[PDB]
Write a structure and sequence with these properties.
The complex is a heterotetramer, with two copies of chain A and two copies of chain B. Chain A has a two-stranded antiparallel sheet with strand order 2-5. In chain A, strands 3-4 form a two-stranded antiparallel ribbon. Chain A has a single domain, classed as Caspase-like (Alpha-Beta Plaits), CATH 3.30.70. Helices cover 26% and strands 19% of the residues of chain A. Chain A is globular, with a radius of gyration of 16 Å. By secondary structure, chain A is of the alpha+beta class. Chain A has two helices and five strands; from the N terminus they run ββββααβ. In chain A, a hairpin with a 3-residue loop joins strand 3 and strand 4. Chain A starts with a strand and ends in a 14-residue tail after the last strand. Chain B is an alpha/beta fold. Chain B has one domain: Rossmann fold, CATH 3.40.50. Helix content of chain B is 25%, strand content 19%. Chain B contains four helices and seven strands; from the N terminus they run αβαβαβββαββ. In chain B, the strands form two sheets. A four-stranded parallel β-sheet of chain B has the order 2-1-3-6, sandwiched between helices. Classes of the chains: A alpha+beta, B alpha/beta. At the A-B interface, strand 2, strand 3, strand 4 and helix 1 of A face helix 1, helix 2, helix 4 and strand 6 of B. Chains A, C: This is Caspase-1 subunit p10. Chains A, C: Heterotetramer that consists of two anti-parallel arranged heterodimers, each one formed by a 20 kDa (Caspase-1 subunit p20) and a 10 kDa (Caspase-1 subunit p10) subunit.
Chain lengths: 88, 173, 88, 173
């Protein structure tokens, strides 16, 4: 037979900035958001779910300086925690 | 040790892995057998543009992200300097890849110039917009268009401006 | 002196449905999303942060039926966990 | 016991409250003294519309939400049957309320008809749109326009359609 499913579900978008605003990039060091995300994934993928890791990446941007940006999570439809379980 | 497949990504011990399945029960996305599973990732990066300035340093982002997603166990597809039409075609194709059926999750990564409305294709200018909307990516990856990835996390990452403003206000300390 | 602050930060939006789609309402029992949210807040505000509560509300919608909808979290810029600590 | 100020909301014990400050350190939003704090909430509900059908049952939502937000410790302001212009004025006014200075958080709740673009005001029709955008709410509550609520969680809740589709696809079981 046929069963009904949600058309949109289990999504998470992580943007580099809040709407209306810029995201920065160093010419030899790449983008700040990307670099910060790699750093944080490398360090937190083992223990936290992706939602939490994104929150932590946001938290590292808390104190602004010469160049400011605030990463934003969008259109979340995750019904469960996504753990990467690196090494598994 | 960081010479292994996971590289600089910190490993999750079996003690910690089963203690995570204790804090939350069946509220965690199921993970497939490491043996059989065919995990896919896709990075689209625009560095060379027709009119708008060159994204010097995007290579370090491609390197970094590709290596990271591979560490997490994904087969990283890298695509470069595409139009909004070209990106749709590639997103359409990624949505049709058979490996998703034997996968548990996916990662989409977009790195390009961006405006308030969306992500810039290689041929973008103010007179002739070449823009991929956030809406388009989700639409193309949902249950209607990507049934293989039903009930499975799809992680979209976007590196881009979302407008021109610096995103700051002043206040007295 | 003057210090720089992020223009947009510490936000969370919780919508009743995914974009393009409808949200339901019973004429004597009110809206499903609202009712489900009250239920879940009443039961989980003491232990989980609001982000998690929203995920759980989403999880209760997982299995669809005659009327389907998937609540969506939008524009998240929370840098910290928000606990309500009810009774405090 | 549920006759207290928190009603049907389950209380958080002091043992559990300090065990939460152990799982995560200074990664939790600071909470003000129960004695002095002046928490504000705001519910805008549209039930009576000029052209579009009546939202029978919205009263149970107003009742439920108001009681819940009060339980959590907020002084609930309830506004009804407003135009998009009227909602802006009220959102502008809520953003100017002095109590936010002595508050730690806020809750905004909107319950109305909705379309893809935003939330419907009382005078909405297809020929003459009366729509409040999600963008407007955030803009009006940010650090530039609502400096009292800087570094403090702002929770927006929206009950509304976001289009006409049922949001479902079929699949073989």
């Amino acid at each position: 037979a046929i069963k009904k499913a949600h058309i949109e579900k289990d999504f998470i978008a992580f943007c580099s900035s809040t709407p209306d605003n810029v995201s920065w990039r160093h010419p030899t060091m790449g983008s700040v958001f990307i670099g910060r995300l790699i750093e944080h994934m490398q360090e937190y993928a083992c223990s936290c779910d992706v939602e939490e890791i994104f929150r932590k990446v946001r938290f590292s941007f808390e104190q602004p300086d010469g160049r400011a940006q605030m990463p934003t999570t969008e259109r979340v439809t995750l019904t469960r925690c996504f753990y990467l379980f690196p090494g598994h | 040790t960081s010479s292994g497949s996971e590289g600089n990504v910190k490993l999750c011990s079996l003690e910690e892995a089963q203690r995570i399945w204790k804090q939350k029960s069946a509220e965690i996305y199921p993970i497939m057998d490491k043996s059989s599973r065919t995990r896919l990732a896709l990075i689209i990066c625009n560095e060379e543009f027709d009119s708008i300035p060159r994204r010097t340093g995007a290579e370090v982002d491609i390197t970094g992200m590709t290596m990271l997603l591979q560490n997490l166990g994904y087969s990283v597809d890298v695509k470069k300097n595409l139009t909004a039409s070209d990106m749709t075609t590639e997103l359409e194709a990624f949505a049709h890849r058979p490996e998703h059926k034997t996968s548990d999750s996916t990662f989409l990564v977009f790195m390009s110039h961006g405006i308030r409305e969306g992500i810039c294709g290689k041929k973008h200018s103010e007179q002739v917009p070449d823009i991929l909307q956030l809406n388009a990516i989700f639409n193309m990856l949902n249950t209607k268009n990507c049934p293989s990835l039903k009930d499975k996390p799809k992680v979209i990452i976007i590196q881009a401006c979302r407008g021109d403003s610096p995103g700051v206000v002043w206040f007295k300390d």
